[PDB]
Amino acid sequence: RAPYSGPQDLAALLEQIGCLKYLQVFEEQDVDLRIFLTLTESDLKEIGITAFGPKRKMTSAIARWHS
């Protein structure tokens, strides 16, 4: 199998956590994977992610893939 070291773009990360419905929010804010992986919960709020569920999934993903 092809070596893998995690999502290589934001859409891939969002698909992995079931959050593709937020892809456009990040595209309109011009936030790519590199920037996403630096975000705080406060940042996610500023971007437009207010619902508890998606915020929690995204903060968990950021912790997992930050590296």
Author numbering: 2 to 68
Question: Could you share sentences copied from the article?
Answer:
Recent work has revealed that ANKS6 interacts with a related protein called ANKS3. Both ANKS6 and ANKS3 have a similar domain structure, with ankyrin repeats at the N-terminus and a SAM domain at the C-terminus. SAM domains consist of approximately 70 amino acids and adopt a globular structure generally containing a core of five α-helices. The protein-protein interactions of SAM domains are typically mediated by two distinct surfaces on the domain, termed the mid-loop (ML) and end-helix (EH) surfaces. Here we define the ANKS6/ANKS3 interaction by discovering that the ANKS6 SAM domain binds to the SAM domain of ANKS3.
Because the wild-type SAM domain is relatively insoluble, forming heterogeneous polymers, it cannot be crystallized directly. We therefore used a strategy that has proven successful for a number of other SAM domain polymers, where we attempt to crystallize SAM domains with mutations in the polymer interface. We were able to obtain a crystal structure of the L52A mutant. ANKS3-SAM L52A crystallized in space group P41 with two molecules in the asymmetric unit and the structure was solved to 1.6 Å resolution. Each SAM domain has the characteristic five α-helical fold and chains in the asymmetric unit are nearly identical (RMSD of 0.29 Å on backbone atoms and 0.3 Å on all atoms). Examination of the crystal packing reveals a triple helix of intertwined SAM polymers. Individual SAM polymers contain 8 SAMs per helical repeat, with each helical repeat measuring 72 Å in diameter and 100 Å in length. As expected from the mutational studies described above, the ANKS3 SAM domains associate via sequential interactions of ML and EH surfaces. The ML-surface, formed by residues spanning loop 2 through helix 4, is composed of a shallow hydrophobic patch (residues V32, I36, L40, and I48) flanked by negatively charged residues (D31, D33, D44, E47). The EH-surface encompasses the N-terminal portion of helix 5 and contains a critical Phe (F53) which packs against the hydrophobic patch of a neighboring ML-surface.
